Design a protein around this ligand. Structure first.
Ligand SMILES: NC(=[NH2+])NCCC[C@H](N)C(=O)O
Ligand code: NA
Length: 419
Protein backbone atom coordinates (compact mmCIF):
# COMPACT_ATOMS: atom_id res chain seq x y z
CA UNK A 1 0.00 0.00 0.00
CA UNK A 2 0.91 3.68 -0.04
CA UNK A 3 0.04 4.26 3.63
CA UNK A 4 2.57 4.42 6.45
CA UNK A 5 2.78 1.52 8.90
CA UNK A 6 0.33 1.29 11.82
CA UNK A 7 2.02 2.68 14.92
CA UNK A 8 3.76 2.66 17.15
CA UNK A 9 6.81 2.28 14.91
CA UNK A 10 10.41 1.51 16.03
CA UNK A 11 13.38 1.28 13.69
CA UNK A 12 15.60 -1.73 14.42
CA UNK A 13 19.33 -1.18 15.12
CA UNK A 14 22.17 -3.12 13.55
CA UNK A 15 23.13 -4.64 16.95
CA UNK A 16 19.65 -6.15 17.47
CA UNK A 17 18.97 -9.80 16.69
CA UNK A 18 19.56 -10.54 13.03
CA UNK A 19 18.09 -13.61 11.29
CA UNK A 20 20.48 -13.23 8.31
CA UNK A 21 22.88 -11.05 6.34
CA UNK A 22 22.25 -9.99 2.69
CA UNK A 23 25.04 -9.94 0.09
CA UNK A 24 24.93 -9.89 -3.77
CA UNK A 25 26.55 -11.78 -6.66
CA UNK A 26 28.57 -10.81 -8.71
CA UNK A 27 30.52 -10.36 -5.49
CA UNK A 28 32.15 -7.32 -3.91
CA UNK A 29 33.38 -9.27 -0.84
CA UNK A 30 35.99 -12.00 -0.32
CA UNK A 31 34.90 -15.63 -0.15
CA UNK A 32 36.65 -15.96 3.22
CA UNK A 33 34.17 -13.39 4.58
CA UNK A 34 31.18 -15.36 3.28
CA UNK A 35 32.64 -18.50 4.85
CA UNK A 36 33.12 -16.84 8.22
CA UNK A 37 29.60 -15.37 8.08
CA UNK A 38 27.98 -18.69 7.20
CA UNK A 39 29.71 -20.50 10.08
CA UNK A 40 27.13 -18.95 12.51
CA UNK A 41 24.61 -16.96 10.52
CA UNK A 42 22.33 -17.29 7.49
CA UNK A 43 23.76 -15.68 4.40
CA UNK A 44 21.20 -14.67 1.77
CA UNK A 45 22.87 -14.15 -1.62
CA UNK A 46 21.03 -12.10 -4.25
CA UNK A 47 21.38 -13.61 -7.74
CA UNK A 48 19.72 -12.87 -11.11
CA UNK A 49 18.54 -16.37 -11.98
CA UNK A 50 18.31 -19.99 -10.92
CA UNK A 51 21.45 -20.73 -13.00
CA UNK A 52 23.31 -17.97 -11.26
CA UNK A 53 22.24 -19.41 -7.87
CA UNK A 54 23.80 -22.69 -8.94
CA UNK A 55 27.02 -21.01 -10.07
CA UNK A 56 27.27 -19.44 -6.60
CA UNK A 57 26.53 -22.79 -4.91
CA UNK A 58 29.40 -24.34 -6.85
CA UNK A 59 31.77 -21.59 -5.64
CA UNK A 60 30.52 -21.90 -2.05
CA UNK A 61 31.03 -25.63 -2.21
CA UNK A 62 34.59 -25.27 -3.58
CA UNK A 63 35.41 -22.89 -0.77
CA UNK A 64 34.04 -25.03 2.07
CA UNK A 65 31.14 -22.71 2.90
CA UNK A 66 28.52 -24.05 5.36
CA UNK A 67 25.67 -24.59 2.86
CA UNK A 68 23.13 -25.19 5.63
CA UNK A 69 23.36 -21.39 6.22
CA UNK A 70 23.16 -20.37 2.51
CA UNK A 71 19.97 -19.03 1.09
CA UNK A 72 19.12 -17.11 -2.16
CA UNK A 73 16.82 -14.41 -3.51
CA UNK A 74 16.32 -14.23 -7.30
CA UNK A 75 16.12 -10.58 -8.43
CA UNK A 76 17.95 -8.30 -10.82
CA UNK A 77 20.42 -5.94 -9.19
CA UNK A 78 22.76 -3.28 -10.54
CA UNK A 79 25.43 -3.43 -7.77
CA UNK A 80 26.80 -5.22 -4.72
CA UNK A 81 26.13 -2.27 -2.38
CA UNK A 82 23.42 -4.07 -0.46
CA UNK A 83 23.93 -1.67 2.46
CA UNK A 84 22.65 1.18 0.40
CA UNK A 85 19.62 -0.07 -1.55
CA UNK A 86 18.06 -2.90 0.44
CA UNK A 87 15.17 -2.22 2.77
CA UNK A 88 15.25 -0.81 6.29
CA UNK A 89 13.74 -2.79 9.19
CA UNK A 90 11.20 -1.46 11.66
CA UNK A 91 8.81 -2.84 14.22
CA UNK A 92 5.23 -1.60 13.82
CA UNK A 93 1.75 -2.29 15.19
CA UNK A 94 3.36 -3.32 18.50
CA UNK A 95 4.44 -6.83 17.46
CA UNK A 96 5.21 -6.87 13.74
CA UNK A 97 8.44 -6.49 11.78
CA UNK A 98 8.23 -4.58 8.49
CA UNK A 99 10.44 -3.38 5.68
CA UNK A 100 10.74 0.26 4.56
CA UNK A 101 11.58 1.09 0.98
CA UNK A 102 12.92 4.51 -0.11
CA UNK A 103 14.20 6.19 -3.31
CA UNK A 104 17.75 4.96 -3.72
CA UNK A 105 19.96 8.01 -4.28
CA UNK A 106 21.64 6.47 -7.38
CA UNK A 107 20.58 5.91 -11.02
CA UNK A 108 20.31 2.17 -10.34
CA UNK A 109 16.72 1.13 -10.98
CA UNK A 110 17.11 -2.58 -10.23
CA UNK A 111 18.87 -1.82 -6.92
CA UNK A 112 16.05 0.66 -6.20
CA UNK A 113 13.33 -1.89 -6.92
CA UNK A 114 14.93 -4.64 -4.89
CA UNK A 115 13.24 -4.12 -1.46
CA UNK A 116 9.94 -5.49 -2.80
CA UNK A 117 11.66 -8.83 -3.51
CA UNK A 118 13.25 -8.80 -0.07
CA UNK A 119 9.89 -8.25 1.64
CA UNK A 120 8.32 -11.03 -0.46
CA UNK A 121 11.17 -13.45 0.41
CA UNK A 122 10.97 -12.65 4.10
CA UNK A 123 7.17 -12.72 4.21
CA UNK A 124 6.81 -9.24 5.70
CA UNK A 125 4.91 -6.12 4.74
CA UNK A 126 6.72 -3.29 2.97
CA UNK A 127 6.06 0.45 3.33
CA UNK A 128 7.22 3.15 0.92
CA UNK A 129 8.92 6.16 2.48
CA UNK A 130 9.20 8.78 -0.28
CA UNK A 131 12.64 10.22 0.53
CA UNK A 132 15.82 9.96 -1.47
CA UNK A 133 17.99 7.86 0.86
CA UNK A 134 20.79 5.37 1.17
CA UNK A 135 21.45 2.81 3.87
CA UNK A 136 25.10 3.76 4.08
CA UNK A 137 24.04 7.15 5.36
CA UNK A 138 21.63 5.74 7.97
CA UNK A 139 21.96 4.26 11.42
CA UNK A 140 19.48 4.04 14.31
CA UNK A 141 20.02 3.36 17.99
CA UNK A 142 16.80 1.31 18.29
CA UNK A 143 15.31 3.96 20.62
CA UNK A 144 14.05 6.44 18.05
CA UNK A 145 17.29 8.28 17.12
CA UNK A 146 18.94 8.16 13.75
CA UNK A 147 22.13 9.81 12.56
CA UNK A 148 22.67 10.85 8.95
CA UNK A 149 24.92 13.20 7.03
CA UNK A 150 23.46 16.37 5.52
CA UNK A 151 22.56 14.73 2.17
CA UNK A 152 19.42 13.47 3.93
CA UNK A 153 18.24 17.11 3.64
CA UNK A 154 20.10 18.32 0.56
CA UNK A 155 19.02 15.37 -1.66
CA UNK A 156 15.39 16.01 -0.55
CA UNK A 157 15.53 19.78 -1.12
CA UNK A 158 11.93 20.07 -2.33
CA UNK A 159 10.95 19.20 1.27
CA UNK A 160 11.53 21.26 4.41
CA UNK A 161 13.71 19.70 7.10
CA UNK A 162 10.49 19.34 9.10
CA UNK A 163 8.87 17.35 6.28
CA UNK A 164 11.95 15.11 6.02
CA UNK A 165 11.90 14.50 9.80
CA UNK A 166 8.19 13.72 9.63
CA UNK A 167 8.71 11.06 6.98
CA UNK A 168 11.32 9.44 9.20
CA UNK A 169 8.87 9.58 12.14
CA UNK A 170 5.93 8.14 10.16
CA UNK A 171 7.81 5.26 8.48
CA UNK A 172 10.59 4.48 10.99
CA UNK A 173 9.43 5.87 14.35
CA UNK A 174 12.41 8.25 14.38
CA UNK A 175 11.72 11.02 16.92
CA UNK A 176 15.27 12.36 16.99
CA UNK A 177 16.57 12.73 13.44
CA UNK A 178 20.12 13.86 14.00
CA UNK A 179 21.31 15.15 10.65
CA UNK A 180 24.82 16.61 10.67
CA UNK A 181 27.29 18.12 8.21
CA UNK A 182 29.50 15.31 6.94
CA UNK A 183 32.99 15.64 8.48
CA UNK A 184 35.00 13.58 5.95
CA UNK A 185 35.38 15.92 2.99
CA UNK A 186 34.79 13.25 0.31
CA UNK A 187 32.08 12.74 -2.27
CA UNK A 188 30.03 10.10 -0.63
CA UNK A 189 28.66 11.75 2.53
CA UNK A 190 27.69 8.49 4.28
CA UNK A 191 27.71 8.26 8.06
CA UNK A 192 29.22 4.74 7.82
CA UNK A 193 32.50 6.30 6.70
CA UNK A 194 32.90 8.21 9.98
CA UNK A 195 30.42 7.02 12.63
CA UNK A 196 28.81 3.94 14.00
CA UNK A 197 26.56 3.21 16.99
CA UNK A 198 28.05 0.16 18.64
CA UNK A 199 25.26 0.01 21.25
CA UNK A 200 22.61 2.43 22.45
CA UNK A 201 25.27 4.06 24.69
CA UNK A 202 28.36 3.76 22.46
CA UNK A 203 29.40 5.49 19.27
CA UNK A 204 32.57 5.06 17.24
CA UNK A 205 33.86 8.20 15.51
CA UNK A 206 36.74 8.20 13.05
CA UNK A 207 39.98 9.99 13.96
CA UNK A 208 42.74 11.17 11.65
CA UNK A 209 46.25 12.56 12.18
CA UNK A 210 46.53 16.12 13.54
CA UNK A 211 47.62 17.57 10.12
CA UNK A 212 44.89 15.82 8.08
CA UNK A 213 42.50 18.50 6.73
CA UNK A 214 39.45 16.87 8.39
CA UNK A 215 41.09 16.46 11.78
CA UNK A 216 39.15 19.24 13.51
CA UNK A 217 35.82 18.32 11.87
CA UNK A 218 36.15 14.77 13.27
CA UNK A 219 37.24 16.00 16.73
CA UNK A 220 34.22 18.32 16.77
CA UNK A 221 31.96 15.37 15.84
CA UNK A 222 33.43 13.26 18.66
CA UNK A 223 32.88 16.15 21.07
CA UNK A 224 29.29 16.57 19.89
CA UNK A 225 28.38 12.97 20.77
CA UNK A 226 30.40 13.00 24.01
CA UNK A 227 28.27 15.96 25.18
CA UNK A 228 25.13 14.16 24.29
CA UNK A 229 22.93 12.16 26.55
CA UNK A 230 22.08 8.75 25.03
CA UNK A 231 18.82 6.72 25.14
CA UNK A 232 19.91 5.08 28.39
CA UNK A 233 20.46 8.52 30.09
CA UNK A 234 24.27 8.48 30.35
CA UNK A 235 26.53 10.39 28.00
CA UNK A 236 27.64 8.39 24.98
CA UNK A 237 30.83 6.39 25.36
CA UNK A 238 32.73 7.79 22.38
CA UNK A 239 35.33 5.48 20.87
CA UNK A 240 37.81 6.55 18.21
CA UNK A 241 39.22 4.55 15.33
CA UNK A 242 42.43 6.11 14.01
CA UNK A 243 42.70 6.10 10.23
CA UNK A 244 46.34 6.90 9.47
CA UNK A 245 45.92 6.10 5.75
CA UNK A 246 42.18 6.45 5.15
CA UNK A 247 41.40 2.91 6.33
CA UNK A 248 37.64 2.22 6.57
CA UNK A 249 37.62 1.09 10.17
CA UNK A 250 34.12 2.49 10.90
CA UNK A 251 32.73 0.53 7.93
CA UNK A 252 32.16 -2.60 9.94
CA UNK A 253 29.22 -4.99 10.36
CA UNK A 254 27.73 -5.94 13.73
CA UNK A 255 25.93 -9.24 13.27
CA UNK A 256 24.55 -10.70 16.45
CA UNK A 257 27.55 -11.43 18.74
CA UNK A 258 30.24 -10.85 16.09
CA UNK A 259 31.76 -7.76 14.52
CA UNK A 260 33.41 -7.83 11.09
CA UNK A 261 35.89 -5.04 10.67
CA UNK A 262 37.60 -4.36 7.32
CA UNK A 263 41.40 -4.13 7.55
CA UNK A 264 43.85 -2.98 4.88
CA UNK A 265 47.17 -2.22 6.55
CA UNK A 266 49.48 -1.54 8.23
CA UNK A 267 48.99 -4.51 10.49
CA UNK A 268 49.74 -2.56 13.70
CA UNK A 269 47.18 0.15 12.80
CA UNK A 270 44.61 -2.52 11.88
CA UNK A 271 45.24 -4.19 15.24
CA UNK A 272 44.83 -0.84 17.05
CA UNK A 273 41.40 -0.47 15.43
CA UNK A 274 40.40 -4.02 16.32
CA UNK A 275 41.49 -3.30 19.90
CA UNK A 276 39.09 -0.32 20.08
CA UNK A 277 36.19 -2.56 19.12
CA UNK A 278 37.34 -5.21 21.64
CA UNK A 279 37.49 -2.60 24.45
CA UNK A 280 34.16 -1.10 23.54
CA UNK A 281 32.29 -4.39 23.06
CA UNK A 282 33.13 -7.02 25.65
CA UNK A 283 31.67 -10.41 24.86
CA UNK A 284 31.67 -9.78 21.11
CA UNK A 285 33.96 -11.68 18.75
CA UNK A 286 35.89 -9.02 16.83
CA UNK A 287 37.08 -10.24 13.41
CA UNK A 288 39.47 -8.48 11.09
CA UNK A 289 38.63 -9.06 7.45
CA UNK A 290 41.13 -8.65 4.56
CA UNK A 291 39.67 -7.46 1.28
CA UNK A 292 39.40 -9.28 -2.03
CA UNK A 293 42.13 -8.14 -4.48
CA UNK A 294 39.63 -7.68 -7.35
CA UNK A 295 37.16 -5.58 -5.25
CA UNK A 296 39.34 -4.11 -2.50
CA UNK A 297 38.23 -2.09 0.47
CA UNK A 298 38.30 1.69 -0.04
CA UNK A 299 37.97 4.63 2.40
CA UNK A 300 34.46 5.38 1.15
CA UNK A 301 33.34 1.76 0.59
CA UNK A 302 34.15 -1.36 2.52
CA UNK A 303 32.53 -4.22 4.44
CA UNK A 304 29.50 -2.36 5.87
CA UNK A 305 28.80 -1.04 2.36
CA UNK A 306 28.54 -4.52 0.87
CA UNK A 307 26.37 -6.21 3.53
CA UNK A 308 22.99 -5.62 5.15
CA UNK A 309 21.72 -7.28 8.29
CA UNK A 310 18.24 -8.80 8.19
CA UNK A 311 15.87 -8.61 11.18
CA UNK A 312 14.01 -11.54 12.63
CA UNK A 313 10.36 -11.47 11.59
CA UNK A 314 9.53 -13.40 14.75
CA UNK A 315 11.75 -11.21 16.98
CA UNK A 316 11.41 -11.62 20.73
CA UNK A 317 11.85 -7.91 21.53
CA UNK A 318 12.84 -6.64 25.01
CA UNK A 319 12.18 -2.92 25.57
CA UNK A 320 14.20 -1.69 28.57
CA UNK A 321 15.58 1.58 29.88
CA UNK A 322 18.23 0.54 32.45
CA UNK A 323 18.95 1.81 35.93
CA UNK A 324 22.58 2.97 35.87
CA UNK A 325 25.05 4.77 38.14
CA UNK A 326 24.27 6.19 41.58
CA UNK A 327 20.64 5.38 42.37
CA UNK A 328 18.74 6.97 45.21
CA UNK A 329 16.45 4.12 46.17
CA UNK A 330 15.02 2.98 48.42
CA UNK A 331 13.23 0.96 45.72
CA UNK A 332 15.36 -0.21 42.79
CA UNK A 333 12.69 -1.33 40.34
CA UNK A 334 13.47 -2.30 36.75
CA UNK A 335 10.76 -2.47 34.10
CA UNK A 336 10.75 -4.18 30.73
CA UNK A 337 8.27 -4.83 28.03
CA UNK A 338 8.65 -8.10 26.17
CA UNK A 339 6.83 -8.66 22.88
CA UNK A 340 6.84 -11.85 20.84
CA UNK A 341 6.65 -11.08 17.11
CA UNK A 342 6.37 -14.89 16.72
CA UNK A 343 3.03 -14.60 18.65
CA UNK A 344 4.40 -17.19 21.04
CA UNK A 345 3.87 -17.59 24.76
CA UNK A 346 6.67 -15.88 26.65
CA UNK A 347 8.14 -17.65 29.65
CA UNK A 348 10.24 -17.11 31.68
CA UNK A 349 11.27 -13.47 31.90
CA UNK A 350 14.13 -13.19 34.37
CA UNK A 351 16.53 -10.69 35.87
CA UNK A 352 20.04 -12.12 36.13
CA UNK A 353 22.05 -10.23 38.72
CA UNK A 354 25.22 -10.13 40.76
CA UNK A 355 25.93 -8.17 43.91
CA UNK A 356 29.39 -6.71 44.70
CA UNK A 357 31.16 -8.57 41.93
CA UNK A 358 31.39 -12.05 43.42
CA UNK A 359 30.43 -15.54 42.32
CA UNK A 360 27.94 -16.28 39.65
CA UNK A 361 24.95 -14.31 38.37
CA UNK A 362 21.65 -15.42 39.99
CA UNK A 363 18.27 -15.59 38.18
CA UNK A 364 15.09 -14.08 39.64
CA UNK A 365 11.77 -14.18 37.82
CA UNK A 366 10.28 -10.85 36.94
CA UNK A 367 6.63 -10.21 37.75
CA UNK A 368 4.15 -9.60 34.93
CA UNK A 369 2.19 -6.53 36.05
CA UNK A 370 0.08 -6.25 32.91
CA UNK A 371 0.12 -7.79 29.50
CA UNK A 372 3.72 -7.81 28.21
CA UNK A 373 4.96 -5.54 31.04
CA UNK A 374 7.39 -7.00 33.56
CA UNK A 375 9.08 -5.60 36.64
CA UNK A 376 11.57 -6.58 39.30
CA UNK A 377 12.69 -4.92 42.50
CA UNK A 378 16.18 -5.35 43.98
CA UNK A 379 15.76 -6.16 47.67
CA UNK A 380 18.00 -6.33 50.70
CA UNK A 381 20.63 -3.96 49.36
CA UNK A 382 22.87 -1.83 51.56
CA UNK A 383 24.29 1.60 50.92
CA UNK A 384 27.16 1.39 48.41
CA UNK A 385 26.29 -2.12 47.19
CA UNK A 386 27.11 -2.46 43.51
CA UNK A 387 24.69 -4.31 41.24
CA UNK A 388 25.30 -5.88 37.80
CA UNK A 389 22.21 -7.10 35.95
CA UNK A 390 20.69 -8.11 32.63
CA UNK A 391 17.31 -9.26 31.41
CA UNK A 392 16.61 -12.65 29.88
CA UNK A 393 13.49 -13.88 28.09
CA UNK A 394 12.40 -16.97 26.20
CA UNK A 395 9.31 -17.94 24.26
CA UNK A 396 7.81 -21.20 23.05
CA UNK A 397 8.87 -20.56 19.46
CA UNK A 398 12.36 -21.44 20.77
CA UNK A 399 13.67 -17.88 20.86
CA UNK A 400 15.93 -16.75 23.71
CA UNK A 401 17.08 -13.14 24.11
CA UNK A 402 18.87 -10.98 26.62
CA UNK A 403 18.98 -7.26 27.17
CA UNK A 404 21.62 -6.10 26.50
CA UNK A 405 21.96 -8.32 23.47
CA UNK A 406 25.33 -9.73 24.53
CA UNK A 407 24.05 -10.43 28.07
CA UNK A 408 26.40 -11.42 30.87
CA UNK A 409 29.68 -10.10 29.51
CA UNK A 410 28.42 -6.47 29.52
CA UNK A 411 25.77 -6.08 32.21
CA UNK A 412 24.03 -2.92 33.38
CA UNK A 413 25.76 -1.47 36.51
CA UNK A 414 24.34 0.71 39.30
CA UNK A 415 25.15 1.52 42.90
CA UNK A 416 22.68 1.62 45.75
CA UNK A 417 22.80 5.00 47.54
CA UNK A 418 19.80 4.58 49.83
CA UNK A 419 19.23 8.37 49.88
N1 LIG B 1 27.68 2.40 2.40
C1 LIG B 1 28.69 2.78 1.64
N2 LIG B 1 29.78 3.28 2.20
N3 LIG B 1 28.53 2.70 0.30
C2 LIG B 1 29.57 2.99 -0.65
C3 LIG B 1 28.96 3.06 -2.06
C4 LIG B 1 30.05 3.30 -3.12
C5 LIG B 1 29.52 3.50 -4.55
N4 LIG B 1 30.69 3.71 -5.39
C6 LIG B 1 28.58 4.68 -4.60
O1 LIG B 1 29.01 5.86 -4.45
O2 LIG B 1 27.38 4.45 -4.75
NA1 NA C 1 14.01 1.68 -3.33
Amino acid sequence: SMNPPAGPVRAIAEYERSAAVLVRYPFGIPMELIKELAKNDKVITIVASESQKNTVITQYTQSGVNLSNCDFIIAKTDSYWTRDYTGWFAMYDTNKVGLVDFIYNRPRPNDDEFPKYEAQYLGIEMFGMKLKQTGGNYMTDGYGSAVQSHIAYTENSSLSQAQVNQKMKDYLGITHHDVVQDPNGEYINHVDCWGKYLAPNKILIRKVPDNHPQHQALEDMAAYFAAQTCAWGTKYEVYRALATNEQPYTNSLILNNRVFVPVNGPASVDNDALNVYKTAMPGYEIIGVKGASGTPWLGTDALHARTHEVADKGYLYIKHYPILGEQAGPDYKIEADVVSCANATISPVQCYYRINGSGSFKAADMTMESTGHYTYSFTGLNKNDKVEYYISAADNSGRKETYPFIGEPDPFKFTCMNE
